[PDB]
Amino acid sequence: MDKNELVQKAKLAEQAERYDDMAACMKSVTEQGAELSNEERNLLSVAYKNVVGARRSSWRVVSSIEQKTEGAEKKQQMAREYREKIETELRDICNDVLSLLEKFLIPNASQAESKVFYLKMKGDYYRYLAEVAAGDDKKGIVDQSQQAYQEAFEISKKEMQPTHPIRLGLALNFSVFYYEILNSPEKACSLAKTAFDEAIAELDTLSEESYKDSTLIMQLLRDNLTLWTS
Amino acid sequence: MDKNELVQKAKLAEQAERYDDMAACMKSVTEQGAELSNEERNLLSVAYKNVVGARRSSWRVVSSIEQKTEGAEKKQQMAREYREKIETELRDICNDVLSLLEKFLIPNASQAESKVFYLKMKGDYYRYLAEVAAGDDKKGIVDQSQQAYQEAFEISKKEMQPTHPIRLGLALNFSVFYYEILNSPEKACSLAKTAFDEAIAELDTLSEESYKDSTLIMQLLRDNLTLWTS
Amino acid sequence: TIVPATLPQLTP
Amino acid sequence: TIVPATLPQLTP
């Protein structure tokens, strides 16, 4: 299949909600070594977010059942065994993405826009690994996440406008990392508030399409802040 | 793995929305060769409906695109090849279900309730095969679906009350088979209307629990008739 | 053009 | 307990 044919297939799979196919299509295009386009870069992100997302959601449901079974040791034991099977699938998916980022996307990124995007993606997948990490391995995975996020954060502040969706999206997620993973709510709130306040100052400089995109994310920062503040 | 253990895993899979795992567990319970309990029978039915449903939905979305692309020859060709891949997965799932029915479920069914339920399931899955069937192959597959539904219909009229949910459910599906597969709007409306009216006569003899169950399906019959009659 | 009801139905 | 928002967001 041609690399252009693979991209079209991914678009089909996206509409058909067949994310395994979508992710496989985009993994092959990345394997070609050609620099991904914006369109292709977002197809790859959406693909793998939906693939890893199914397991994250399953892990939460099975974990909740495990806490509720303070009764039968066998039932709770079964839930724990099932949760482990889901965790193993989640690690394979994460590793799969992180491997694509180190081998072909991060090294081949020339512009900062793309470096930030991939570094944020690296931070997101280490974060997902840290949610199901073994107690001893936790810290090492948690530190790998932070580093990637912080590196992306430094590049975005120096090279990108505050209204940029990638910079806004990185802040949103990094902030969530502080709150959900590092259990540090004050830092999460300032990060997200700072990112919203900086974007608010430059809204007059955006075009119609740029404005819809940035405001949508800024609202997500506001939604989290309200949830955290109330 | 204990039959009892597999059923608890199937319920776990349903909670986590891992229908692939749920179907595998229920297939294993069925393969043990014993007759299924009502709860086990319901789990197997839900499992395979979700597994087959994903592909039916994907097939409908890809078919839509394949049509609307009268303005691009390559994109339309891409949609056709993808539809064919989805159609192959759908046929395997249906064949796997039909194999379970002939090798273990229909032969071991002792009560009329299960016989009708398995025969209705056989009609349903041949109907799904008929939707993606090749032009010469379709007439034979359509006849197999009709024969299975007809036998289930004949047994339900003799051995079951008009308010029975399985009987009611079979009438709704069989009437839909006439409408969309055989393109017989008259037979489809008459079949649904008769089933509904016969149910109405015995509503007074029903307990509070069988009441929700029966009236829910009767409403689905009324919704279809309204769609067809207006 | 719209989907008529059949049983079992999806979650969804 | 509930949410919070992260990007990309899952297709429901």
Side-chain angles (χ1 to χ4, degrees), chain B residues 87-130:
Chain B
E87 282 182 3
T88 295
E89 273 190 13
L90 192 155
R91 276 186 285 252
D92 289 349
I93 296 168
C94 288
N95 282 326
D96 172 7
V97 171
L98 294 178
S99 280
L100 276 191
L101 288 157
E102 288 310 357
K103 293 179 179 179
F104 310 79
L105 298 156
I106 281 159
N108 281 98
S110 63
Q111 310 276 84
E113 212 204 80
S114 287
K115 192 70 163 204
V116 172
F117 187 106
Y118 299 132
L119 282 172
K120 169 192 168 298
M121 201 169 173
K122 183 179 170 176
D124 287 341
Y125 284 78
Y126 266 115
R127 168 161 57 91
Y128 302 156
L129 273 183

mmCIF file of all heavy atoms in Angstrom, chain B residues 87-130:
data_model
loop_
_atom_site.group_PDB
_atom_site.id
_atom_site.type_symbol
_atom_site.label_atom_id
_atom_site.label_comp_id
_atom_site.label_asym_id
_atom_site.label_seq_id
_atom_site.Cartn_x
_atom_site.Cartn_y
_atom_site.Cartn_z
ATOM 1 N N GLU B 87 -16.359 -6.640 5.619
ATOM 2 C CA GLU B 87 -17.332 -7.698 5.252
ATOM 3 C C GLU B 87 -16.745 -9.069 5.584
ATOM 4 O O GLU B 87 -17.495 -9.918 6.032
ATOM 5 C CB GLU B 87 -17.652 -7.630 3.763
ATOM 6 C CG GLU B 87 -18.626 -6.541 3.381
ATOM 7 C CD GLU B 87 -18.949 -6.529 1.903
ATOM 8 O OE1 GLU B 87 -18.455 -7.399 1.200
ATOM 9 O OE2 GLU B 87 -19.697 -5.661 1.471
ATOM 10 N N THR B 88 -15.446 -9.258 5.378
ATOM 11 C CA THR B 88 -14.779 -10.550 5.671
ATOM 12 C C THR B 88 -14.811 -10.813 7.176
ATOM 13 O O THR B 88 -15.114 -11.934 7.558
ATOM 14 C CB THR B 88 -13.345 -10.550 5.133
ATOM 15 O OG1 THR B 88 -13.415 -10.465 3.715
ATOM 16 C CG2 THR B 88 -12.568 -11.785 5.512
ATOM 17 N N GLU B 89 -14.510 -9.800 7.985
ATOM 18 C CA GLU B 89 -14.530 -9.945 9.461
ATOM 19 C C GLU B 89 -15.951 -10.272 9.904
ATOM 20 O O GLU B 89 -16.111 -11.131 10.749
ATOM 21 C CB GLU B 89 -14.164 -8.628 10.133
ATOM 22 C CG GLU B 89 -12.682 -8.424 10.324
ATOM 23 C CD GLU B 89 -12.308 -7.240 11.198
ATOM 24 O OE1 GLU B 89 -13.185 -6.709 11.873
ATOM 25 O OE2 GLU B 89 -11.134 -6.871 11.202
ATOM 26 N N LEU B 90 -16.932 -9.604 9.316
ATOM 27 C CA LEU B 90 -18.351 -9.819 9.675
ATOM 28 C C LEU B 90 -18.764 -11.255 9.358
ATOM 29 O O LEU B 90 -19.363 -11.877 10.215
ATOM 30 C CB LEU B 90 -19.194 -8.820 8.885
ATOM 31 C CG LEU B 90 -20.642 -8.689 9.331
ATOM 32 C CD1 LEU B 90 -21.191 -7.335 8.950
ATOM 33 C CD2 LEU B 90 -21.481 -9.782 8.714
ATOM 34 N N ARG B 91 -18.382 -11.772 8.194
ATOM 35 C CA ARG B 91 -18.746 -13.156 7.807
ATOM 36 C C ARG B 91 -18.115 -14.148 8.784
ATOM 37 O O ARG B 91 -18.791 -15.083 9.164
ATOM 38 C CB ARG B 91 -18.388 -13.423 6.345
ATOM 39 C CG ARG B 91 -19.454 -12.943 5.375
ATOM 40 C CD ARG B 91 -19.263 -13.276 3.915
ATOM 41 N NE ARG B 91 -18.232 -12.425 3.362
ATOM 42 C CZ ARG B 91 -18.436 -11.434 2.516
ATOM 43 N NH1 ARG B 91 -19.647 -11.168 2.076
ATOM 44 N NH2 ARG B 91 -17.418 -10.721 2.093
ATOM 45 N N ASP B 92 -16.878 -13.917 9.202
ATOM 46 C CA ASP B 92 -16.228 -14.853 10.149
ATOM 47 C C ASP B 92 -16.988 -14.884 11.475
ATOM 48 O O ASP B 92 -17.190 -15.972 12.001
ATOM 49 C CB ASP B 92 -14.795 -14.428 10.437
ATOM 50 C CG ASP B 92 -13.859 -14.643 9.272
ATOM 51 O OD1 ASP B 92 -14.263 -15.307 8.314
ATOM 52 O OD2 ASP B 92 -12.737 -14.142 9.343
ATOM 53 N N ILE B 93 -17.369 -13.720 11.988
ATOM 54 C CA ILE B 93 -18.112 -13.632 13.276
ATOM 55 C C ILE B 93 -19.443 -14.368 13.133
ATOM 56 O O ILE B 93 -19.785 -15.125 14.018
ATOM 57 C CB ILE B 93 -18.328 -12.163 13.677
ATOM 58 C CG1 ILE B 93 -17.007 -11.445 13.945
ATOM 59 C CG2 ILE B 93 -19.274 -12.062 14.857
ATOM 60 C CD1 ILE B 93 -17.135 -9.957 14.048
ATOM 61 N N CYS B 94 -20.163 -14.117 12.047
ATOM 62 C CA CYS B 94 -21.484 -14.752 11.831
ATOM 63 C C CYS B 94 -21.328 -16.263 11.701
ATOM 64 O O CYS B 94 -22.064 -16.974 12.362
ATOM 65 C CB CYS B 94 -22.133 -14.211 10.568
ATOM 66 S SG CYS B 94 -22.712 -12.510 10.738
ATOM 67 N N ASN B 95 -20.326 -16.708 10.945
ATOM 68 C CA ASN B 95 -20.078 -18.153 10.718
ATOM 69 C C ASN B 95 -19.738 -18.804 12.051
ATOM 70 O O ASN B 95 -20.209 -19.898 12.292
ATOM 71 C CB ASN B 95 -18.993 -18.381 9.667
ATOM 72 C CG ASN B 95 -19.506 -18.185 8.259
ATOM 73 O OD1 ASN B 95 -20.653 -18.487 7.963
ATOM 74 N ND2 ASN B 95 -18.666 -17.664 7.389
ATOM 75 N N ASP B 96 -18.956 -18.120 12.877
ATOM 76 C CA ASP B 96 -18.569 -18.625 14.212
ATOM 77 C C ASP B 96 -19.827 -18.792 15.071
ATOM 78 O O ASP B 96 -19.932 -19.802 15.745
ATOM 79 C CB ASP B 96 -17.539 -17.679 14.818
ATOM 80 C CG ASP B 96 -17.218 -17.995 16.255
ATOM 81 O OD1 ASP B 96 -17.697 -19.020 16.723
ATOM 82 O OD2 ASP B 96 -16.504 -17.205 16.884
ATOM 83 N N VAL B 97 -20.744 -17.830 15.035
ATOM 84 C CA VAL B 97 -22.006 -17.914 15.825
ATOM 85 C C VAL B 97 -22.884 -19.048 15.292
ATOM 86 O O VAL B 97 -23.395 -19.816 16.096
ATOM 87 C CB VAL B 97 -22.765 -16.577 15.817
ATOM 88 C CG1 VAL B 97 -24.141 -16.724 16.429
ATOM 89 C CG2 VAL B 97 -21.987 -15.501 16.542
ATOM 90 N N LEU B 98 -23.038 -19.126 13.974
ATOM 91 C CA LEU B 98 -23.871 -20.174 13.333
ATOM 92 C C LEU B 98 -23.285 -21.559 13.616
ATOM 93 O O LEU B 98 -24.054 -22.505 13.668
ATOM 94 C CB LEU B 98 -23.934 -19.896 11.833
ATOM 95 C CG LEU B 98 -24.667 -18.617 11.457
ATOM 96 C CD1 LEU B 98 -24.640 -18.399 9.964
ATOM 97 C CD2 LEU B 98 -26.089 -18.658 11.955
ATOM 98 N N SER B 99 -21.959 -21.661 13.702
ATOM 99 C CA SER B 99 -21.295 -22.943 14.028
ATOM 100 C C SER B 99 -21.663 -23.337 15.451
ATOM 101 O O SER B 99 -21.956 -24.487 15.668
ATOM 102 C CB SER B 99 -19.808 -22.856 13.862
ATOM 103 O OG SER B 99 -19.444 -22.988 12.504
ATOM 104 N N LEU B 100 -21.666 -22.386 16.375
ATOM 105 C CA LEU B 100 -22.023 -22.703 17.776
ATOM 106 C C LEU B 100 -23.474 -23.175 17.829
ATOM 107 O O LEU B 100 -23.765 -24.064 18.609
ATOM 108 C CB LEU B 100 -21.873 -21.440 18.625
ATOM 109 C CG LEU B 100 -20.476 -21.132 19.143
ATOM 110 C CD1 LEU B 100 -20.541 -20.031 20.181
ATOM 111 C CD2 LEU B 100 -19.839 -22.369 19.729
ATOM 112 N N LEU B 101 -24.357 -22.533 17.072
ATOM 113 C CA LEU B 101 -25.788 -22.900 17.114
ATOM 114 C C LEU B 101 -25.993 -24.320 16.592
ATOM 115 O O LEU B 101 -26.684 -25.078 17.258
ATOM 116 C CB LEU B 101 -26.562 -21.904 16.251
ATOM 117 C CG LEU B 101 -26.716 -20.501 16.819
ATOM 118 C CD1 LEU B 101 -26.971 -19.506 15.711
ATOM 119 C CD2 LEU B 101 -27.837 -20.458 17.830
ATOM 120 N N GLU B 102 -25.416 -24.651 15.441
ATOM 121 C CA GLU B 102 -25.606 -26.007 14.874
ATOM 122 C C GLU B 102 -24.848 -27.062 15.678
ATOM 123 O O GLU B 102 -25.420 -28.104 15.946
ATOM 124 C CB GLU B 102 -25.349 -26.023 13.372
ATOM 125 C CG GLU B 102 -26.442 -25.336 12.569
ATOM 126 C CD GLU B 102 -27.900 -25.709 12.819
ATOM 127 O OE1 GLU B 102 -28.163 -26.606 13.637
ATOM 128 O OE2 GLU B 102 -28.777 -25.100 12.178
ATOM 129 N N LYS B 103 -23.608 -26.790 16.072
ATOM 130 C CA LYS B 103 -22.847 -27.836 16.798
ATOM 131 C C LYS B 103 -23.313 -27.987 18.246
ATOM 132 O O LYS B 103 -23.230 -29.105 18.734
ATOM 133 C CB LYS B 103 -21.325 -27.665 16.733
ATOM 134 C CG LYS B 103 -20.659 -27.846 15.376
ATOM 135 C CD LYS B 103 -19.164 -27.646 15.351
ATOM 136 C CE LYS B 103 -18.585 -27.868 13.971
ATOM 137 N NZ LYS B 103 -17.120 -27.654 13.923
ATOM 138 N N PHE B 104 -23.788 -26.940 18.922
ATOM 139 C CA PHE B 104 -24.128 -27.194 20.346
ATOM 140 C C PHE B 104 -25.441 -26.603 20.864
ATOM 141 O O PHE B 104 -26.041 -27.239 21.721
ATOM 142 C CB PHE B 104 -23.112 -26.500 21.249
ATOM 143 C CG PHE B 104 -21.665 -26.755 20.940
ATOM 144 C CD1 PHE B 104 -21.038 -26.087 19.912
ATOM 145 C CD2 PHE B 104 -20.928 -27.634 21.706
ATOM 146 C CE1 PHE B 104 -19.704 -26.318 19.637
ATOM 147 C CE2 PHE B 104 -19.593 -27.859 21.436
ATOM 148 C CZ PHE B 104 -18.988 -27.203 20.397
ATOM 149 N N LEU B 105 -25.859 -25.425 20.418
ATOM 150 C CA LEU B 105 -26.977 -24.796 21.067
ATOM 151 C C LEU B 105 -28.333 -25.336 20.647
ATOM 152 O O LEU B 105 -29.167 -25.608 21.475
ATOM 153 C CB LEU B 105 -26.890 -23.283 20.909
ATOM 154 C CG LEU B 105 -25.665 -22.612 21.523
ATOM 155 C CD1 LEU B 105 -25.345 -21.291 20.859
ATOM 156 C CD2 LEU B 105 -25.789 -22.448 23.023
ATOM 157 N N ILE B 106 -28.556 -25.426 19.344
ATOM 158 C CA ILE B 106 -29.876 -25.870 18.818
ATOM 159 C C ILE B 106 -30.116 -27.340 19.160
ATOM 160 O O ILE B 106 -31.209 -27.653 19.626
ATOM 161 C CB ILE B 106 -29.958 -25.604 17.311
ATOM 162 C CG1 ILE B 106 -30.270 -24.135 17.032
ATOM 163 C CG2 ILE B 106 -30.973 -26.526 16.667
ATOM 164 C CD1 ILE B 106 -29.883 -23.684 15.659
ATOM 165 N N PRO B 107 -29.135 -28.240 18.971
ATOM 166 C CA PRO B 107 -29.322 -29.654 19.271
ATOM 167 C C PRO B 107 -29.596 -29.945 20.752
ATOM 168 O O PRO B 107 -30.433 -30.754 21.029
ATOM 169 C CB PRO B 107 -27.970 -30.275 18.914
ATOM 170 C CG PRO B 107 -27.328 -29.292 17.983
ATOM 171 C CD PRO B 107 -27.816 -27.943 18.446
ATOM 172 N N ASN B 108 -28.889 -29.266 21.650
ATOM 173 C CA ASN B 108 -29.031 -29.508 23.106
ATOM 174 C C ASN B 108 -30.194 -28.711 23.696
ATOM 175 O O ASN B 108 -30.466 -28.897 24.878
ATOM 176 C CB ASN B 108 -27.733 -29.210 23.851
ATOM 177 C CG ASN B 108 -26.720 -30.324 23.732
ATOM 178 O OD1 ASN B 108 -25.821 -30.263 22.904
ATOM 179 N ND2 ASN B 108 -26.861 -31.348 24.553
ATOM 180 N N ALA B 109 -30.844 -27.849 22.920
ATOM 181 C CA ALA B 109 -31.949 -27.058 23.508
ATOM 182 C C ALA B 109 -33.054 -28.024 23.929
ATOM 183 O O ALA B 109 -33.522 -28.769 23.070
ATOM 184 C CB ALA B 109 -32.455 -26.079 22.491
ATOM 185 N N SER B 110 -33.481 -27.967 25.188
ATOM 186 C CA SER B 110 -34.545 -28.880 25.671
ATOM 187 C C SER B 110 -35.896 -28.160 25.689
ATOM 188 O O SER B 110 -36.860 -28.718 25.173
ATOM 189 C CB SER B 110 -34.191 -29.470 27.004
ATOM 190 O OG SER B 110 -34.086 -28.476 28.003
ATOM 191 N N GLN B 111 -35.954 -26.961 26.256
ATOM 192 C CA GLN B 111 -37.215 -26.182 26.298
ATOM 193 C C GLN B 111 -37.466 -25.451 24.975
ATOM 194 O O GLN B 111 -36.521 -25.212 24.232
ATOM 195 C CB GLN B 111 -37.184 -25.220 27.474
ATOM 196 C CG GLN B 111 -36.788 -25.899 28.765
ATOM 197 C CD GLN B 111 -37.974 -26.559 29.414
ATOM 198 O OE1 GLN B 111 -38.347 -27.680 29.078
ATOM 199 N NE2 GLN B 111 -38.566 -25.856 30.364
ATOM 200 N N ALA B 112 -38.735 -25.157 24.701
ATOM 201 C CA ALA B 112 -39.188 -24.445 23.491
ATOM 202 C C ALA B 112 -38.642 -23.021 23.506
ATOM 203 O O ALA B 112 -38.270 -22.534 22.455
ATOM 204 C CB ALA B 112 -40.688 -24.451 23.433
ATOM 205 N N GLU B 113 -38.587 -22.409 24.685
ATOM 206 C CA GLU B 113 -38.063 -21.033 24.860
ATOM 207 C C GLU B 113 -36.678 -20.942 24.211
ATOM 208 O O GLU B 113 -36.491 -20.104 23.338
ATOM 209 C CB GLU B 113 -37.998 -20.705 26.350
ATOM 210 C CG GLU B 113 -38.242 -19.244 26.665
ATOM 211 C CD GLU B 113 -37.680 -18.695 27.965
ATOM 212 O OE1 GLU B 113 -36.484 -18.391 28.018
ATOM 213 O OE2 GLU B 113 -38.452 -18.563 28.921
ATOM 214 N N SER B 114 -35.754 -21.800 24.633
ATOM 215 C CA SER B 114 -34.374 -21.821 24.089
ATOM 216 C C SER B 114 -34.377 -22.186 22.609
ATOM 217 O O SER B 114 -33.656 -21.554 21.859
ATOM 218 C CB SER B 114 -33.509 -22.764 24.856
ATOM 219 O OG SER B 114 -33.196 -22.220 26.114
ATOM 220 N N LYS B 115 -35.176 -23.172 22.217
ATOM 221 C CA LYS B 115 -35.254 -23.580 20.796
ATOM 222 C C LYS B 115 -35.593 -22.348 19.956
ATOM 223 O O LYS B 115 -34.881 -22.076 19.001
ATOM 224 C CB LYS B 115 -36.337 -24.648 20.630
ATOM 225 C CG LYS B 115 -36.357 -25.367 19.292
ATOM 226 C CD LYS B 115 -35.171 -26.282 19.103
ATOM 227 C CE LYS B 115 -35.341 -27.304 17.999
ATOM 228 N NZ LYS B 115 -34.474 -28.481 18.231
ATOM 229 N N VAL B 116 -36.630 -21.617 20.350
ATOM 230 C CA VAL B 116 -37.071 -20.407 19.609
ATOM 231 C C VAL B 116 -35.956 -19.360 19.664
ATOM 232 O O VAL B 116 -35.662 -18.765 18.638
ATOM 233 C CB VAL B 116 -38.393 -19.885 20.191
ATOM 234 C CG1 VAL B 116 -38.782 -18.545 19.609
ATOM 235 C CG2 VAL B 116 -39.500 -20.887 19.979
ATOM 236 N N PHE B 117 -35.329 -19.197 20.823
ATOM 237 C CA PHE B 117 -34.258 -18.188 20.984
ATOM 238 C C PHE B 117 -33.086 -18.515 20.058
ATOM 239 O O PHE B 117 -32.610 -17.616 19.386
ATOM 240 C CB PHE B 117 -33.799 -18.175 22.439
ATOM 241 C CG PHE B 117 -32.833 -17.074 22.786
ATOM 242 C CD1 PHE B 117 -33.245 -15.980 23.518
ATOM 243 C CD2 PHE B 117 -31.516 -17.133 22.378
ATOM 244 C CE1 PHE B 117 -32.361 -14.965 23.834
ATOM 245 C CE2 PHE B 117 -30.632 -16.118 22.693
ATOM 246 C CZ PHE B 117 -31.055 -15.039 23.424
ATOM 247 N N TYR B 118 -32.660 -19.772 20.020
ATOM 248 C CA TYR B 118 -31.539 -20.169 19.134
ATOM 249 C C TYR B 118 -31.948 -20.079 17.665
ATOM 250 O O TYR B 118 -31.111 -19.749 16.842
ATOM 251 C CB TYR B 118 -30.909 -21.494 19.552
ATOM 252 C CG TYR B 118 -30.315 -21.469 20.933
ATOM 253 C CD1 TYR B 118 -30.573 -22.473 21.841
ATOM 254 C CD2 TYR B 118 -29.504 -20.430 21.336
ATOM 255 C CE1 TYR B 118 -30.043 -22.448 23.115
ATOM 256 C CE2 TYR B 118 -28.968 -20.387 22.608
ATOM 257 C CZ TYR B 118 -29.239 -21.399 23.501
ATOM 258 O OH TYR B 118 -28.717 -21.361 24.751
ATOM 259 N N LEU B 119 -33.177 -20.473 17.350
ATOM 260 C CA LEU B 119 -33.647 -20.398 15.947
ATOM 261 C C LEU B 119 -33.730 -18.933 15.520
ATOM 262 O O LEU B 119 -33.342 -18.639 14.409
ATOM 263 C CB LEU B 119 -34.970 -21.145 15.802
ATOM 264 C CG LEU B 119 -34.820 -22.661 15.737
ATOM 265 C CD1 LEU B 119 -36.166 -23.354 15.783
ATOM 266 C CD2 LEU B 119 -34.055 -23.069 14.497
ATOM 267 N N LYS B 120 -34.195 -18.060 16.405
ATOM 268 C CA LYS B 120 -34.266 -16.613 16.101
ATOM 269 C C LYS B 120 -32.846 -16.087 15.889
ATOM 270 O O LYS B 120 -32.621 -15.349 14.951
ATOM 271 C CB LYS B 120 -34.891 -15.880 17.284
ATOM 272 C CG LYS B 120 -34.801 -14.369 17.221
ATOM 273 C CD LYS B 120 -35.153 -13.721 18.518
ATOM 274 C CE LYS B 120 -34.786 -12.261 18.546
ATOM 275 N NZ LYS B 120 -33.329 -12.083 18.394
ATOM 276 N N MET B 121 -31.914 -16.531 16.720
ATOM 277 C CA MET B 121 -30.504 -16.103 16.613
ATOM 278 C C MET B 121 -29.956 -16.567 15.265
ATOM 279 O O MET B 121 -29.241 -15.800 14.652
ATOM 280 C CB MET B 121 -29.689 -16.701 17.757
ATOM 281 C CG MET B 121 -28.412 -15.971 18.049
ATOM 282 S SD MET B 121 -27.628 -16.508 19.579
ATOM 283 C CE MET B 121 -26.093 -15.599 19.491
ATOM 284 N N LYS B 122 -30.306 -17.776 14.826
ATOM 285 C CA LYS B 122 -29.853 -18.316 13.521
ATOM 286 C C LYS B 122 -30.403 -17.435 12.401
ATOM 287 O O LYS B 122 -29.648 -17.119 11.493
ATOM 288 C CB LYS B 122 -30.330 -19.761 13.372
ATOM 289 C CG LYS B 122 -29.878 -20.490 12.117
ATOM 290 C CD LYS B 122 -30.378 -21.911 12.055
ATOM 291 C CE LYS B 122 -30.142 -22.568 10.717
ATOM 292 N NZ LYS B 122 -30.555 -23.987 10.722
ATOM 293 N N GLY B 123 -31.664 -17.034 12.490
ATOM 294 C CA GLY B 123 -32.248 -16.145 11.475
ATOM 295 C C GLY B 123 -31.552 -14.796 11.458
ATOM 296 O O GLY B 123 -31.291 -14.292 10.381
ATOM 297 N N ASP B 124 -31.245 -14.254 12.624
ATOM 298 C CA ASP B 124 -30.591 -12.971 12.749
ATOM 299 C C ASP B 124 -29.245 -12.965 12.096
ATOM 300 O O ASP B 124 -28.915 -12.068 11.379
ATOM 301 C CB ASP B 124 -30.363 -12.627 14.211
ATOM 302 C CG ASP B 124 -31.602 -12.254 14.923
ATOM 303 O OD1 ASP B 124 -32.585 -11.912 14.290
ATOM 304 O OD2 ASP B 124 -31.592 -12.302 16.143
ATOM 305 N N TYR B 125 -28.455 -13.977 12.364
ATOM 306 C CA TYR B 125 -27.130 -14.005 11.821
ATOM 307 C C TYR B 125 -27.052 -14.324 10.342
ATOM 308 O O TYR B 125 -26.081 -13.989 9.711
ATOM 309 C CB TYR B 125 -26.199 -14.828 12.697
ATOM 310 C CG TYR B 125 -25.803 -14.079 13.946
ATOM 311 C CD1 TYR B 125 -26.654 -13.978 15.017
ATOM 312 C CD2 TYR B 125 -24.596 -13.440 14.031
ATOM 313 C CE1 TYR B 125 -26.298 -13.280 16.136
ATOM 314 C CE2 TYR B 125 -24.241 -12.739 15.149
ATOM 315 C CZ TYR B 125 -25.096 -12.664 16.190
ATOM 316 O OH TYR B 125 -24.732 -11.969 17.280
ATOM 317 N N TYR B 126 -28.075 -14.959 9.787
ATOM 318 C CA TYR B 126 -28.090 -15.225 8.361
ATOM 319 C C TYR B 126 -28.547 -13.952 7.698
ATOM 320 O O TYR B 126 -28.159 -13.670 6.597
ATOM 321 C CB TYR B 126 -28.988 -16.394 7.987
ATOM 322 C CG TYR B 126 -28.253 -17.694 7.906
ATOM 323 C CD1 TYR B 126 -28.529 -18.708 8.773
ATOM 324 C CD2 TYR B 126 -27.258 -17.889 6.977
ATOM 325 C CE1 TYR B 126 -27.843 -19.888 8.718
ATOM 326 C CE2 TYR B 126 -26.567 -19.071 6.909
ATOM 327 C CZ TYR B 126 -26.866 -20.065 7.781
ATOM 328 O OH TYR B 126 -26.191 -21.247 7.738
ATOM 329 N N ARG B 127 -29.391 -13.195 8.382
ATOM 330 C CA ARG B 127 -29.842 -11.878 7.882
ATOM 331 C C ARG B 127 -28.629 -10.956 7.772
ATOM 332 O O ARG B 127 -28.498 -10.303 6.748
ATOM 333 C CB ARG B 127 -30.898 -11.293 8.821
ATOM 334 C CG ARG B 127 -31.222 -9.833 8.566
ATOM 335 C CD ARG B 127 -32.541 -9.429 9.180
ATOM 336 N NE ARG B 127 -32.597 -9.664 10.606
ATOM 337 C CZ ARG B 127 -32.251 -8.777 11.519
ATOM 338 N NH1 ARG B 127 -31.825 -7.586 11.152
ATOM 339 N NH2 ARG B 127 -32.320 -9.079 12.796
ATOM 340 N N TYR B 128 -27.751 -10.971 8.771
ATOM 341 C CA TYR B 128 -26.535 -10.122 8.740
ATOM 342 C C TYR B 128 -25.656 -10.543 7.562
ATOM 343 O O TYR B 128 -25.128 -9.675 6.903
ATOM 344 C CB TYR B 128 -25.785 -10.201 10.069
ATOM 345 C CG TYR B 128 -26.570 -9.810 11.292
ATOM 346 C CD1 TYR B 128 -26.218 -10.292 12.536
ATOM 347 C CD2 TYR B 128 -27.645 -8.945 11.220
ATOM 348 C CE1 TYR B 128 -26.920 -9.939 13.673
ATOM 349 C CE2 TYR B 128 -28.359 -8.579 12.345
ATOM 350 C CZ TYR B 128 -27.996 -9.082 13.577
ATOM 351 O OH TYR B 128 -28.675 -8.742 14.700
ATOM 352 N N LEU B 129 -25.530 -11.846 7.327
ATOM 353 C CA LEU B 129 -24.757 -12.408 6.190
ATOM 354 C C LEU B 129 -25.406 -11.980 4.874
ATOM 355 O O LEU B 129 -24.686 -11.666 3.945
ATOM 356 C CB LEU B 129 -24.756 -13.931 6.295
ATOM 357 C CG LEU B 129 -23.646 -14.539 7.145
ATOM 358 C CD1 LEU B 129 -23.720 -16.051 7.113
ATOM 359 C CD2 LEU B 129 -22.282 -14.076 6.680
ATOM 360 N N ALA B 130 -26.732 -11.968 4.825
ATOM 361 C CA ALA B 130 -27.481 -11.582 3.613
ATOM 362 C C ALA B 130 -27.210 -10.128 3.233
ATOM 363 O O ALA B 130 -27.241 -9.831 2.047
ATOM 364 C CB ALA B 130 -28.947 -11.838 3.793
#
